[PDB]
Amino acid sequence: MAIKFLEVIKPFCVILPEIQKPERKIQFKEKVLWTAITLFIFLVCCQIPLFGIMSSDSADPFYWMRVILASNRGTLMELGISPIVTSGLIMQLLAGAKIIEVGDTPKDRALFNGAQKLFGMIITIGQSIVYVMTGMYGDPSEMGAGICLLITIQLFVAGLIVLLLDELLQKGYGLGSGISLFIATNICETIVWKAFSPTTVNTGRGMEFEGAIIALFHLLATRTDKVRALREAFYRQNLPNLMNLIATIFVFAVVIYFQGFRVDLPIKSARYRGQYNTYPIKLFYTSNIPIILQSALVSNLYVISQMLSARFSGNLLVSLLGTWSDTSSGGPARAYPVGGLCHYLSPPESFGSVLEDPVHAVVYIVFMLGSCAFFSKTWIEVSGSSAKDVAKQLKEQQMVMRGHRETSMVHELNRYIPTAAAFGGLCIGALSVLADFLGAIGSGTGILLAVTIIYQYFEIFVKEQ
Amino acid sequence: MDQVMQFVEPSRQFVKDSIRLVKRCTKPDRKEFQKIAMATAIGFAIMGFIGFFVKLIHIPINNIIVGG
């Protein structure tokens, strides 16, 4: 006899701003315009620095994480999409586990959405306060209470704006999902910036262009040893290499090739004779969502571990969760987990590190593959994308497989969809690990996310068109 | 050995099912792959170009805003 959790949250939901759904079906061109405007606002927020940050050359523990989360350090998007993803993951997991029973009634569904939004906002507030209190922007006493409050408010407002923009796109004002568009754009921006950045960074020997292509052209023009300059550009230790760019391009092509793999199931209209359509079961049936869930969980684990290490030094549980050290080895400060679970979860930076610590690499690979497969299997059940649900959708669409009743369709789909999901998740994890080992610019996870998001957006565009 | 068999059998079934899935997967035709790659490249180029320009424009503004 549990009082409904949604009923408990219902008074708070009234305070939550909710975007009105469009009374009229929006024109496709108008949807494109809305998507462009929202993307531009998102990019501007990604570039606007937070007010009152004290300039600390403190290590970035989350540099790999920020690209996945569409977060830029020291900007209004420092939190990025992490609170929204975390709240979605938690609420979906609770619904799948049946700890929270969501009724089919619109009131229950509306409460469920409001609760997810409220949790996302609460997580955003908590994370912003946590980041301010952890000294990431400077010592809280030195910054002063007023600056800390201003930064926390700014982070909260930025997160609320992002949540509203995502709601606006999802509700059909724009194309696809705002979270997916933001992730894809951030990854594309980071890769293009690393490729073509005209900024000059002063390495001890000389001023070197950050952008791999610009640096290559400058070195070729300015150096008598053109071959040596090209080799240095290919194998630069401290800046993005042309070889790394080539590796990224190769990974991008490989990912597209795997993305194209599908199993076509022949479906016929019962009403119309001779109408043959294929139901494509993609190899990556569960999409990027297993990656997104795994990365969000790992991100939360890293944040918790860093907080616990900062506040409670030397406790056995804290050491088990993770020990962080800031390695300023001739580079911008990066906080790496040198021990504990966070250490095992962290990707090895190179084949050399994999050779030095083979156990760590094996544990990381096994964890990534297992987590991706588990998340894909759980996601199909939670999402309502199970073979039964697909068969129900086909029945609603009056599409019937030739010679097979709808129940037969369910059995055939049930044969393939679980296998497709688990194998696709394993393949995705393997591709991510391989790209990370190859050092692809923008990360293996980032490249996979961008390619798959772009492919889905293209499919949406073609279908609407 | 019963525990080892218990772990091995689900994995062996999963491998067999994966082989079945891969065997029934239609591999993309070269024309389909080229079309998909071109569309993905166009989307990547548009988003990367917009982000790169926005960042480049903001960098002088940020230097003026934060630098001083």
Binding site: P17, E18, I19, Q20, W34, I37, I41, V44, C45, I48, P49, F51, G52, L76, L150, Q154, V157, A158, I161, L164, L165, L168, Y173 | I65, V66, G68
Partner: peptide, 29 residues
């Protein structure tokens, strides 16, 4: 809340952040 109000609020927030930066520079200077 309408989409246009959401956009207006986002733009106002961005402008407010710029104004805060300007005020902070004036106070420091």
């Amino acid at each position: 809340v309408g989409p246009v109000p959401v956009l207006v609020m986002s733009l106002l927030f961005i402008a407010s952040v710029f104004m805060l930066h300007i005020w902070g520079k004036y106070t420091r200077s």
